[PDB]
């Protein structure tokens, strides 16, 4: 439509005029701010078999002052996108502006609080809000587009624009066109894809204004209750998604922009293990191949890595981790069994062409097998190959079913297995069984078994096939010539020549065998084999595998290893490999070029032998070093009072007034005398604190007040130095009504009730007219029983200058308004020196905020990726405390002790210093009259990878320096 690399018709995409399947995986660049890590995603979703990632951009961080764009350092996309590109990855990229996510204000930056108009409308106010963001961050997705030679190929205006209220008119063209006009004005030419939250048919091709190039939508539809990870409700596997997709975009290719990958949790809730189960690889299979059976072209997983909410980053009703149970885990690991499951199906899709040509049809209980109890769903086509998805009818069933087939092929309409037995379909499973299988100029007539991948060596073709535990398969292939095993024992295979071709039968075995039939050779393994086998793409012009593009795909290897291989590239008698492992590991490489002499592994020569059938085997031993880790609690621990506002001495005079009579929140009008919404006043990240100053009369009895700092937010409040109490926090309560009880007060005397308030980030917008983003953050309603409320003039404070916030390094959410804080003593080498010793394993002995600081060195080997985790011990029923722990100035874990469930925070290399010194920075809030302490406080470390990895540089890390600005 506007440029001719990136097209497309009604079965798929096609990339410089050829057809690809867009399989692709959700990474956010801003929950992963480390650019070598974020290379090693890339890495580990090309090693799937993947071709493109999705991402949100977070305007939130990146435009914290209205009006200076700021996506510099940690925050720039453009290492991100030259990642993409090294890994050979392309991209959908998906700015928002509203992006919701699980992040505070869903992507809006708390100034919008302050927008008179409607969020996500076509009212001027917000649109013109939006402008100076979409014309940056366009411009650099415009400079890396494919057609300037970049990874990007697509683009999603807005997010799930799907459901309106309160009167606004929806759906809005005039709006959708206006979102898609910005970024076309900031130069982007690559089609428009738009993520409706379900198949409705928003703002689909044919609409008029407002509609985008092609339509997607959607689907999680196993929900997100991770409590009950076996239960698989029933009728929640869609059945009705081709049917939708013609009736409402016929004629663009079928696009799932966010498919189910995993869960979010709450506060409180059972955790990220618990979504990783319940969205696990038996999930993966039915669900996915499920999605196949409509002939998807355009998949995307949401999320393929999910990183971590660092820095106050994340909206009010999640906490620190973001792992999501998603295939990769927070801490970068490939164990879970749903990464090797996916790696099968992603591998399938990269060499099977004839998927996206077949003509799907209708699901069926009968025709194609001989048992209700299965449904099958067909692909298919002529001469190009057919697909037939098999599942239990009651998608949940964990029964073993055993069936024959009849399909239709080339050789006639046959009754599988012909050679006697039955196919076995074992519980939660699914299959894709294919006939007329092309493998490069020969035909599979059929197989039962599901194809891993096949390549076209010069010497010969590789096909791979596996089954599951406990099955009987078969297969047939047009040929003259006979069938005969080449490893493994003749024991359970079966075989029947014809005049045309030749009918194998095989039992799944621990054991692999391979066969030969001509000069294709098929290797017959077991699912657990199978999980082990990669696909690199092989080089032959540098190092980098390039994108997933017909002749780059065909010219790849088949490698046996262990736990990753990244890439393969030849270079003169050289093959080479980088990969990963977690344990001494035998590599075997099948389709070694007839030029390769000698192998390396990771840059080191490596001794190999040669099997009869032409297969190059060698070993890589595993030896960790020590790891050396210090223990926390013997630090030299430094303590500063980071409260000292309920002191009789503090000056509060350079506070900023919260007096403004009129606010411009439009969402809820004042119920006190001045506005007391900290974002108001350009307030809108981690702890608050408020200051209401009064003359006593002598006959106050009570002080009421209604605190809002969202879902399991907590509040303490002094009277100067007299703790009146605390809301200990509920994730059931995002505001909370206390009243307190005051002290016999002397008349005429001036007192000052201090209150602290946890913000747990800015509320989600997702729909269009309830502006639920302006819910606000701070005081809303009080009551000092017997005065008017104009008794008290109220001061308050966020993090230190608001919207003029100080720290650009580490963007405009990380810190909020304590004292050490506003100070900069979060930072590595704080004036610590005249501090007091004492450490957070003491703790309090009263209610209060305690601010704790040392260092300590590491020294891990070079050429190890060694997973680090802060521990904070909760083996017993603690008292209410909360905790933040900022490394080397990154806030990288929120605690609350009374909710949970977080105790395990991972830090990553680059924001940690592996061969030097590092500094943690922790507060210590008592939300209990006799205080409070850390039970324990550890580092720790998982299993030690041997990597591939180049060195990761460390963050910017910004040490302390004495701010002009602040209040003391
Ligand atoms: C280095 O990197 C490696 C990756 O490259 C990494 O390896 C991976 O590790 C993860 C674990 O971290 C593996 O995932 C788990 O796998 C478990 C094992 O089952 C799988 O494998 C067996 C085959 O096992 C044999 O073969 C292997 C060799 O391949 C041997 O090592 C084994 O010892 C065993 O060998 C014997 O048998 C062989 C015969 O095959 C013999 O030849 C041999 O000589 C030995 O005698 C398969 O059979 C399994 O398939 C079956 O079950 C699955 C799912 O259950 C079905 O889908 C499938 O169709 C088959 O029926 C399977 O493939 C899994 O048990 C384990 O599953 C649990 O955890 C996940 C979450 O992590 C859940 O999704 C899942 O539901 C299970 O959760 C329950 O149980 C766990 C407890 O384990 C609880 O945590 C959880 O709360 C839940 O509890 C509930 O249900 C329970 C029911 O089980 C119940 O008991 C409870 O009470 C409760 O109600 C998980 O998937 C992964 O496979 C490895 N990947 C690879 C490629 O190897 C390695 O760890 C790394 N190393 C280090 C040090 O870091
Ligand atoms: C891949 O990435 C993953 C995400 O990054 C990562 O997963 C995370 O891994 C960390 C580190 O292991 C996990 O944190 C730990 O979790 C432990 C509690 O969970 C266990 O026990 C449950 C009991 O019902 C099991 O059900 C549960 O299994 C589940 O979770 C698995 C995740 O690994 C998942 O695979 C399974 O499928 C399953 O669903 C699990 O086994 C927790 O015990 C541990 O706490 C301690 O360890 C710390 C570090 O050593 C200590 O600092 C801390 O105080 C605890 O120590 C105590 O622990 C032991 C047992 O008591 C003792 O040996 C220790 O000495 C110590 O003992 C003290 O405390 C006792 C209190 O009970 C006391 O009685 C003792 O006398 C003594 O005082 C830690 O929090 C984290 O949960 C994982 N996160 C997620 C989202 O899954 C994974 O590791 C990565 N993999 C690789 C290879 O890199
Ligand atoms: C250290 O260890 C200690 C001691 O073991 C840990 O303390 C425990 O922490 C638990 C987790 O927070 C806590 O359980 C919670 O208690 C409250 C009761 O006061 C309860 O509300 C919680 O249950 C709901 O909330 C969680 C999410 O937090 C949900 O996952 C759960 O399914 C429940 O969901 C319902 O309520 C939500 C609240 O609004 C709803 O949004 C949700 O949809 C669902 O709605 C229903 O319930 C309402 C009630 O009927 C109803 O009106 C509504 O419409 C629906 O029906 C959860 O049980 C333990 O109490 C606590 N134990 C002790 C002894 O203190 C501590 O966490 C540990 N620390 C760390 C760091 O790990
Ligand atoms: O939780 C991860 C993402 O949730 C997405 O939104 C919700 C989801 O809920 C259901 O209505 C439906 O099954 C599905 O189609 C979706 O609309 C957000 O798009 C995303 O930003 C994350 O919040
Ligand atoms: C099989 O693939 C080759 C390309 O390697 C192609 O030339 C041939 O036409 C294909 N066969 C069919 C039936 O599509
Ligand atoms: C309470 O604190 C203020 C300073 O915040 C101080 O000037 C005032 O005298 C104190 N009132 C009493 C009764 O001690
Ligand atoms: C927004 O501006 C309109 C038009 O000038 C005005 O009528 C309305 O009262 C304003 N609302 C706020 C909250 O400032
Ligand atoms: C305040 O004044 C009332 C009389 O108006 C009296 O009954 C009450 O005891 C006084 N309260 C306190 C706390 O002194
Ligand atoms: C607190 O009281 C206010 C004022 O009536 C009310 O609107 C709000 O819903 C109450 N909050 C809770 C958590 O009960
Ligand atoms: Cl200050």
């Not at 091709?205 to 409590?227: E, N, Q, R, W």
């Not at 449904?375 to 086509?381: I, Q």
């Not at 075995?509 to 092989?538: C, E, F, H, M």
């Not at 390094?809 to 003593?825: I, K, S």
């Amino acid at each position: 439509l506007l440029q001719k690399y990136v097209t497309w018709d009604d079965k798929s995409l096609f990339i410089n005029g050829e057809r690809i399947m867009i399989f692709s995986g959700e990474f956010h660049p801003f929950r992963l701010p480390v650019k070598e890590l974020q290379l090693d995603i890339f890495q580990k979703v090309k090693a799937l078999g993947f071709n493109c990632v999705s991402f949100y951009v977070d305007w939130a961080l990146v435009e914290g002052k209205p009006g200076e764009y700021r996506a510099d350092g940690i925050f720039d996309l453009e290492p991100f996108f030259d990642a993409a590109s090294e890994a050979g990855i392309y991209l959908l990229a998906r700015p928002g502006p509203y992006i919701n996510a699980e992040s505070s204000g869903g992507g809006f930056p708390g100034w919008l609080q302050r927008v008179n108009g409607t969020l996500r409308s076509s009212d001027k106010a917000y649109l013109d809000a939006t402008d100076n963001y979409v014309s940056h961050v366009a411009a650099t997705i415009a400079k890396y587009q494919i057609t300037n030679g970049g990874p990007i190929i697509l683009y999603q205006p807005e997010n799930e624009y799907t459901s309106g209220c309160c009167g606004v008119e929806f759906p809005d063209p005039v709006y959708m066109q206006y979102v898609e006009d910005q970024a076309r004005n900031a130069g982007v030419v690559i089609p428009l894809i738009n993520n409706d939250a379900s198949a409705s048919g928003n703002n689909a091709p044919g609409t008029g204004k407002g509609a985008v190039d092609i339509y997607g939508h959607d689907s999680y539809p196993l929900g997100f209750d991770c409590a009950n990870p076996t239960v698989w409700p029933s009728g929640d596997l869609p059945t009705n998604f081709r049917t939708l997709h013609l009736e409402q975009s016929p004629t663009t290719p079928y696009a799932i922009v966010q498919f189910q990958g995993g869960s979010y949790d709450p506060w409180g809730g059972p955790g990220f293990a618990a979504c990783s189960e319940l969205l696990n690889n038996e999930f993966e299979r039915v669900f996915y191949k499920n999605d196949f059976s409509f002939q998807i072209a355009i998949m995307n997983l949401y999320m393929i890595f999910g990183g971590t909410n660092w820095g106050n980053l994340g909206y009010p009703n999640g906490y620190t981790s973001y792992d999501y149970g998603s295939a990769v885990t927070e801490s970068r690991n490939i164990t879970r069994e749903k990464y090797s499951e996916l790696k099968l199906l992603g591998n399938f899709a990269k060499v099977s062409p004839g998927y996206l040509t077949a003509s799907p049809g209708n699901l069926t209980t009968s025709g194609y097998a001989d048992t209700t109890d299965l449904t099958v769903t067909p692909l298919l086509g002529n001469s190009t190959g057919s697909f037939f998805v098999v599942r239990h009818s009651d998608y949940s069933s964990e029964e073993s079913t055993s069936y024959k087939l009849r399909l239709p092929t080339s050789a006639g309409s046959v009754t599988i297995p012909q050679l006697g037995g039955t196919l076995t379909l074992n519980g939660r499973d699914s299959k894709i069984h294919v006939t007329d299988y092309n493998v490069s100029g020969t035909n599979i007539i059929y197989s039962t078994a599901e194809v891993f991948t096949w390549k076209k060596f010069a010497d010969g073709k590789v096909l791979v096939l596996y089954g599951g535990a406990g099955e009987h398969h078969e297969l047939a292939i047009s040929t003259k010539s006979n069938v005969t095993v080449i490893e493994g024992s003749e024991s359970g295979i079966s075989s029947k020549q014809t005049s045309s071709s030749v009918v194998v039968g095989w039992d799944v075995s621990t054991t692999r065998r391979i066969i030969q039939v001509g000069d294709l050779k098929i290797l017959l393994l077991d699912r657990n084999s199978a999980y082990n086998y990669w696909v690199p793409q092989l080089a032959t012009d540098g190092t980098s595998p390039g994108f997933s593009t017909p002749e780059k795909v065909a010219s790849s290897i088949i490698v046996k290893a262990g736990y990753l291989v990244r890439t393969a590239y030849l270079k003169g008698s050289g093959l080479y490999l980088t990969a990963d492992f977690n344990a001494t590991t035998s590599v075997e490489v099948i389709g070694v070029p007839s030029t390769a002499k000698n192998l390396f592994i990771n840059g080191d020569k490596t001794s190999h032998t040669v099997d009869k059938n032409g297969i190059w085997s060698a070993t890589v031993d595993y030896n960790a070093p020590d790891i050396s880790l210090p223990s926390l609690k013997d630090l030299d621990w430094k303590y500063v009072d980071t409260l000292p506002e309920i002191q009789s001495s503090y000056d509060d005079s350079l506070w900023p007034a919260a007096d403004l009579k009129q606010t411009k929140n439009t969402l809820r009008s004042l119920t006190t005398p001045t506005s007391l919404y900290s974002s108001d006043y350009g307030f809108h990240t981690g702890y608050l604190l408020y200051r209401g100053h009064f003359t006593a009369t002598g006959n106050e009895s009570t002080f009421a007040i209604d605190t809002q700092g969202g879902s399991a937010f907590g509040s303490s409040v002094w009277l100067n130095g007299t703790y009146l109490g605390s809301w200990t926090g509920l994730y059931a309560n995002s505001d909370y009504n206390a009243t307190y009880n005051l002290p016999q007060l002397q008349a005429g005397k001036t007192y000052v009730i201090t209150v602290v308030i946890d913000n747990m980030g800015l509320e989600e917008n997702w729909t269009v007219g309830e502006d639920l983003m302006k819910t606000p953050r701070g005081i809303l309603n009080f009551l000092l029983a017997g005065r008017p409320s104009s008794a008290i003039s109220w001061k308050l404070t966020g993090n230190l200058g608001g919207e003029d916030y100080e720290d650009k390094v580490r963007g405009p959410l990380n810190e909020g308004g304590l004292y050490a804080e506003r100070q900069g003593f979060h930072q590595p080498e704080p004036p610590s020196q005249n501090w007091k010793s004492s450490s957070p394993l003491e703790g309090l002995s009263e209610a209060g905020i305690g601010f704790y600081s040392a260092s300590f060195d590491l020294d891990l080997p070079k050429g190890w990726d060694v997973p680090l985790f802060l521990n904070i011990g909760n083996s017993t029923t603690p008292s209410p405390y909360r905790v933040q722990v900022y490394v080397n100035g990154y806030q990288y874990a929120k605690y609350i002790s009374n909710i949970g469930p977080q105790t395990s925070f991972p830090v990553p290399e680059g924001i940690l210093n592996y061969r030097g010194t590092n500094w943690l920075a922790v507060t210590l809030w008592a939300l209990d009259s006799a205080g409070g302490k850390l039970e324990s406080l550890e580092l720790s470390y998982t299993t030690p990878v041997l990597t591939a990895l180049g060195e990761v540089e460390s963050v910017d890390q910004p040490k302390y320096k004495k701010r002009k600005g602040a209040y003391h």
